[PDB]
């Protein structure tokens, strides 16, 4: 008979991998182990409800996130840092410094892992910092640094 799998059959099937499972063995194994549940109207409707709920939740989470994140990321942000003779910067503003800047200036609250910068800016100028806002969408951040005192 038909069942709504709760875990892996040949791979995690929590999504409700409807199949035909040898009613005898199906009942015995799935019920003794909870591997699945009967595929009746009630359970099917409950699964559909939970699935659409989570789908819309994720859709909203991604939509709300991408839009304003990109829009604001299209802004300009600047800071100050001392520099020496010959353009040899005394330090380097890593991702942590940029995170602190965006947290204290504009209150963007982006993770230090989602926003990464390995090159370790050492120049006294402007630069665009890409961000991993979305696995399929990204935006740049116009960071700036200038001499101080």
């Amino acid at each position: 008979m038909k069942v709504i799998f709760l875990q892996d059959v040949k791979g995690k099937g929590k999504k409700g991998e409807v199949k035909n499972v040898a009613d005898g063995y199906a009942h015995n194994f799935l019920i003794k182990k909870g591997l699945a549940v009967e595929a009746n109207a009630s359970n099917i409707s409950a699964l559909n409800g939970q699935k659409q709920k989570e789908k819309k939740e994720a859709i909203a989470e991604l939509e709300q996130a991408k839009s304003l994140k990109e829009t604001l990321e299209k802004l300009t942000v600047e800071l100050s840092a001392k520099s020496g003779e010959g353009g040899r910067l005394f330090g380097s503003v890593t991702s942590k410094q940029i995170t602190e800047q965006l947290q204290k200036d504009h209150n963007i609250k982006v993770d230090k892992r989602k926003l990464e910068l390995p090159d370790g800016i050492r120049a006294l100028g402007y630069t665009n910092v890409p961000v991993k806002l979305h696995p399929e969408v990204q935006a740049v951040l116009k960071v700036h640094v200038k001499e101080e005192a």
Partner: protein, 58 residues
């Protein structure tokens, strides 16, 4: 000896061989002693296979 769910029991009938002899015969029921929660608890009583498929839970 009968299915608890439906009135399935041992019936009787003839056994007509070649020449149409009329030896008497019995007809059993394909019932098994599986665990079912007919009442508030399981009891492990007899139940017919035809009724077991897509019917009461074991």
């Amino acid at each position: 000896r009968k299915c608890v769910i439906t009135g399935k029991k041992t019936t009787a009938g003839n056994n007509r061989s070649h020449a149409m002899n009329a030896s008497k015969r019995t007809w059993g029921a394909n019932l098994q002693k599986v665990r079912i929660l007919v009442n508030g608890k399981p009891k492990k009583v007899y139940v017919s296979a035809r009724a077991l498929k897509s019917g009461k839970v074991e």
